[PDB]
Amino acid sequence: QGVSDLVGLPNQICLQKTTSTILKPRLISYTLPINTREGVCITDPLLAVDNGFFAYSHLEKIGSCTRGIAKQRIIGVGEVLDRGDKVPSMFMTNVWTPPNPSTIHHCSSTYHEDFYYTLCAVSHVGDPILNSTSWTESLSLIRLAVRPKSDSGDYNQKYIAITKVERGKYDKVMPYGPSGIKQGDTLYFPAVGFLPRTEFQYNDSNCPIIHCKYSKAENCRLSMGVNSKSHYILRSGLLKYNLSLGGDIILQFIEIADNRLTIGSPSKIYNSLGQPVFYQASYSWDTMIKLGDVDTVDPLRVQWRNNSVISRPGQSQCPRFNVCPEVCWEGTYNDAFLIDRLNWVSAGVYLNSNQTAENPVFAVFKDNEILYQVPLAEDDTNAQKTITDCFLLENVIWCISLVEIYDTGDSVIRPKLFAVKIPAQCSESGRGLVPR
Ligand SMILES: *[C@@H]1O[C@H](COC2O[C@@H](C)[C@@H](O)[C@@H](O)[C@@H]2O)[C@@H](O[C@@H]2O[C@H](CO)[C@@H](O)[C@H](O)[C@H]2NC(C)=O)[C@H](O[C@@H]2O[C@@H](C)[C@@H](O)[C@@H](O)[C@@H]2O)[C@H]1NC(C)=O
Ligand SMILES: *[C@@H]1O[C@H](CO)[C@@H](O[C@@H]2O[C@H](CO)[C@@H](O)[C@H](O)[C@H]2NC(C)=O)[C@H](O)[C@H]1NC(C)=O
Ligand SMILES: *[C@@H]1O[C@H](CO)[C@@H](O[C@@H]2O[C@H](CO)[C@@H](O)[C@H](O)[C@H]2NC(C)=O)[C@H](O)[C@H]1NC(C)=O
Ligand SMILES: *[C@@H]1O[C@H](CO)[C@@H](O)[C@H](O)[C@H]1NC(C)=O
The neighbour count for residue 98, using CB atoms within 10 Å, is 17
Any bridge partners for residue 143, and if so which? 117, 158
Q: Whose CA is nearest to atom 8 of ligand 2?
A: 125
Return the closest-CA partner of residue 58 out of 95, 20, 8, 26: 95
Q: Whose CA is nearest to atom 31 of ligand 1?
A: 321
Which strands make up the sheet holding 157-162, listed edge to edge?
Answer: 104-112, 115-122, 139-145, 157-162
d(CA 306, ligand 4 centre) in Å: 6
Which of 321, 323, 355, 356 should be mutated for ligand 1, with most atoms under 8 A from CB? 321
The sign of the CA dihedral 106, 47, 293, 260 is: negative
Are 222 and 327 in contact, with CB atoms under 8 Å apart?
yes
> In Å, how far from its chain's centre is CA 276?
14
Are 269 and 278 in contact, with CB atoms under 8 Å apart?
yes
Q: Which residues, at least 6 apart from 328, have a Cβ–Cβ distance to it below 8 Å?
A: 223, 284, 285, 314, 315, 317, 318
d(CA 368, ligand 1 centre) in Å: 17
Which strands make up the sheet holding 290-296, listed edge to edge?
Answer: 267-272, 275-280, 290-296, 301-304
Q: Does a cis peptide bond (omega within 30 degrees of 0) precede residue 319?
A: no
Which ligand 4 atom sits closest to the C-alpha of 304? 13
Return the closest-CA partner of residue 368 out of 293, 312, 254, 288: 288
Which ligand 4 atom sits closest to the C-alpha of 292? 13
**Does the beta carbon of 257 sit less than 6 angstroms from any atom of ligand 3?**
no
d(CA 204, ligand 4 centre) in Å: 22
Return the closest-CA partner of residue 388 out of 372, 404, 377: 404
Question: What gap in Å lies between CA 339 and CA 13, rounded to an integer?
Answer: 9
Solving technique? X-ray
Are 15 and 356 in contact, with CB atoms under 8 Å apart?
no
Q: Which residues, at least 6 apart from 334, have a Cβ–Cβ distance to it below 8 Å?
A: 281, 289, 312, 348, 349, 350, 351, 385, 386
Return the closest-CA partner of residue 386 out of 435, 335, 328: 335
Query: What is the CB < 6 Å shell around ligand 2?
Result: 125-127, 130-131, 134
Question: What gap in Å lies between CA 52 and CA 123, rounded to an integer?
Answer: 32
Return the closest-CA partner of residue 146 out of 24, 263, 228, 52: 52
Return the closest-CA partner of residue 240 out of 258, 252, 223: 252
Return the closest-CA partner of residue 92 out of 35, 133, 33: 33
Are 329 and 315 in contact, with CB atoms under 8 Å apart?
no
The neighbour count for residue 274, using CB atoms within 10 Å, is 10
Are 27 and 417 in contact, with CB atoms under 8 Å apart?
yes
Backbone angles phi, psi at 4, to 5 degrees: -145, 180
Question: What gap in Å lies between CA 272 and CA 401, rounded to an integer?
Answer: 16
Which ligand 3 atom sits closest to the C-alpha of 243? 1
Question: What gap in Å lies between CA 411 and CA 242, rounded to an integer?
Answer: 44
The neighbour count for residue 99, using CB atoms within 10 Å, is 6
> In Å, how far from its chain's centre is CA 301?
18
Are 67 and 374 in contact, with CB atoms under 8 Å apart?
no
Resolution of the coordinates, Å = 2.2
d(CA 29, ligand 2 centre) in Å: 40
Side chain identity at residue 251, one-letter code: L
Return the closest-CA partner of residue 333 out of 380, 401, 395, 232: 401
Return the closest-CA partner of residue 194 out of 241, 240, 230: 230
Q: Where are the domains of the chain?
A: 1-436
Side chain identity at residue 302, one-letter code: V
Side chain identity at residue 360, one-letter code: P
Which of 322, 354, 369 should be mutated for ligand 1, with most atoms under 8 A from CB? 354
d(CA 366, ligand 4 centre) in Å: 14
> Dihedral (C-alpha) 420, 426, 429, 434: value to the nearest 10 degrees?
130
d(CA 99, ligand 2 centre) in Å: 20
d(CA 69, ligand 2 centre) in Å: 13
**Does the beta carbon of 160 sit less than 6 angstroms from any atom of ligand 3?**
no
What are the Cα distances from residue 74, in Å, to 55, 71, 92, 315? 11, 10, 12, 32
- For the chain, give the secondary structure using H, E and C: CCEECCCCCCCCCCCCCCCCCCCCCEECCECCCCCCCCCEEEEEEEEEEECCEEEEEEEEEECCCCCCEEEEEEEEEEEEEECCCCCEEEEEEEEECCCCCCCEEEEEEEEECCEEEEEEEECCCCCCCCCCCCCCCCEEEEEEECCCCCCCCCCCEEEEEECEEECCCCCEEEECCCECEEECCEEEEEEEEEEEHHHCCCCHHHCCCCCCCCCCCCHHHHCCCCCCCCCEEEEEEEEEEECCCCCCCEEEEEEECCCCCCCCCCEEEEEECCEEEEEECCCCCCCCCEEEEEEECCCEEEEECCCCCCCCCCCCCCCCCCCCCCCCCCCCCECEEEEECCCCEEEEEEECCCCCCECEEEEEEECCEEEEEEECCCCCCEEEEEEEEEEEECCEEEEEEEEEEEECCCCEEEEEEEEEECCCCCCCCCCCCCCC
Which ligand minimizes its atom distance to the CA of 302? 4
Which ligand 3 atom sits closest to the C-alpha of 245? 5
Q: Whose CA is nearest to atom 1 of ligand 4?
A: 306
Q: For the domain bounded by 1-436, which CATH number is listed?
A: 2.120.10.10
Which ligand minimizes its atom distance to the CA of 133? 2
| Cα 248-254-259 angle, rounded to 5 deg | 175
What are the Cα distances from residue 377, in Å, to 107, 307, 350, 373, 383? 28, 25, 12, 12, 9
Q: Which residues, at least 6 apart from 255, have a Cβ–Cβ distance to it below 8 Å?
A: 168, 170, 193, 235, 236, 237, 299, 300
Are 290 and 280 in contact, with CB atoms under 8 Å apart?
yes
Query: What is the CB < 6 Å shell around ligand 1?
Result: 319-322, 354
Are 315 and 293 in contact, with CB atoms under 8 Å apart?
no
